[PDB]
Amino acid sequence: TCPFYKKIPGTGFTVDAFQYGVVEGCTAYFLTHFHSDHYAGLSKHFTFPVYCSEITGNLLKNKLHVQEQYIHPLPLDTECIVNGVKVVLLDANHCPGAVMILFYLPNGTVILHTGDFRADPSMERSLLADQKVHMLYLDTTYCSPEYTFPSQQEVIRFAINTAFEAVTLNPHALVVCGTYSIGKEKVFLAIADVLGSKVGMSQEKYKTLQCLNIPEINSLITTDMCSSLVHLLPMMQINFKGLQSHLKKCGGKYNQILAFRPTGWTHSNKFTRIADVIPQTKGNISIYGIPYSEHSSYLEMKRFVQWLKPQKIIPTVNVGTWKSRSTMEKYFREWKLEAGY
Numbered sequence: 001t002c003p004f005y006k007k008i009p010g011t012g013f014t015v016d017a018f019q020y021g022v023v024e025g026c027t028a029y030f031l032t033h034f035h036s037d038h039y040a041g042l043s044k045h046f047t048f049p050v051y052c053s054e055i056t057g058n059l060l061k062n063k064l065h066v067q068e069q070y071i072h073p074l075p076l077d078t079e080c081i082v083n084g085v086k087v088v089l090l091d092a093n094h095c096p097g098a099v100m101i102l103f104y105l106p107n108g109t110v111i112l113h114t115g116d117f118r119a120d121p122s123m124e125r126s127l128l129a130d131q132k133v134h135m136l137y138l139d140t141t142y143c144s145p146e147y148t149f150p151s152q153q154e155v156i157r158f159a160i161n162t163a164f165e166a167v168t169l170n171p172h173a174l175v176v177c178g179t180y181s182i183g184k185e186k187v188f189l190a191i192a193d194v195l196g197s198k199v200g201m202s203q204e205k206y207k208t209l210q211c212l213n214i215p216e217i218n219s220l221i222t223t224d225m226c227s228s229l230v231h232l233l234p235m236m237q238i239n240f241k242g243l244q245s246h247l248k249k250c251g252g253k254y255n256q257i258l259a260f261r262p263t264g265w266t267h268s269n270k271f272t273r274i275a276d277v278i279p280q281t282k283g284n285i286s287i288y289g290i291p292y293s294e295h296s297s298y299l300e301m302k303r304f305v306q307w308l309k310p311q312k313i314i315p316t317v318n319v320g321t322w323k324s325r326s327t328m329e330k331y332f333r334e335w336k337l338e339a340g341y
């Protein structure tokens with residue numbers, strides 16, 4: 001059945017709740033972003049109103065074939081009325097089209113649902129600065145102090161410098177980057193920009209990227225693999241067997257692969273700096289795992305919450321075990337006693 005942390009009290013609304021059939025009492029289904037664990041259940045047969053960003057609405061129409069009459073895209077940073085209730089969509093700093101949702105309840109309660117997000121100090125100057133938020137539905141993916149990672153800018157500098165040095169040493173090296181969802185497009189786009197190439201990819205993945213409103217995208221991507229020296233493959237193929245196989249397909253144009261796997265966190269982060277990352281190598285194939293995150297680190301999450309000072313926190317991630325729930329509640333209390341709210 002639909003869990004309580006997907007329901008907005010005092011409304012008929014749900015958030016990211018498309019896999020439970022008809023939720024009793026729901027008049028509007030919100031979708032924060034186009035990742036499968038959140039859209040699970042949507043299709044061309046859905047006949048209730050879906051509220052989302054413009055970019056998420058492009059993906060619902062083109063990838064899932066949801067009918068246009070049920071897609072309700074909203075502009076960001078704009079007060080809108082939905083079924084009698086004031087709402088605002090804010091940029092979540094996650095994947096393209098991802099939003100947080102502010103609900104202004106008729107009784108005066110204000111609720112923020114973060115969806116999935118990577119907290120940033122820039123959020124402290126959005127429309128959130130303008131009123132008090134009482135309840136926070138929080139993306140707690142990395143809510144434990146072991147989870148440190150570098151800035152996105154530091155990680156992209158590493159990737160660009162590594163790829164440019166390798167290809168300038170060997171002009172017959174191919175660069176491959178893994179993907180299994182939208183998000184993390186800066187990794188492959190930044191590397192292709194430094195090398196003077198388009199990114200080559202499957203027709204399915206090109207279609208997906210063409211829904212994202214990225215400026216000048218026709219200049220950066222292609223389905224012609226032969227004209228490209230940065231290829232995108234499924235994340236599952238980013239291993240020695242998959243890569244050796246791909247190299248065979250390129251017909252002797254290339255004699256070396258340098259591959260990137262943009263993971264979330266990996267426990268090389270508890271010890272190793274970005275400067276010190278090394279690949280796994282077999283023969284003429286090297287694979288780099290780079291810690292490019294689109295979720296908050298522990299410290300980024302803690303700063304956002306201590307700034308916002310909510311009266312009540314409802315976690316939305318890691319909620320399935322009692323030890324995870326109790327650990328998280330302990331951190332929330334620490335933060336509140338340190339900051340004084």
Ligand code: NI
Binds near residue numbers: 033035094
């Ligand atoms: Ni997500």
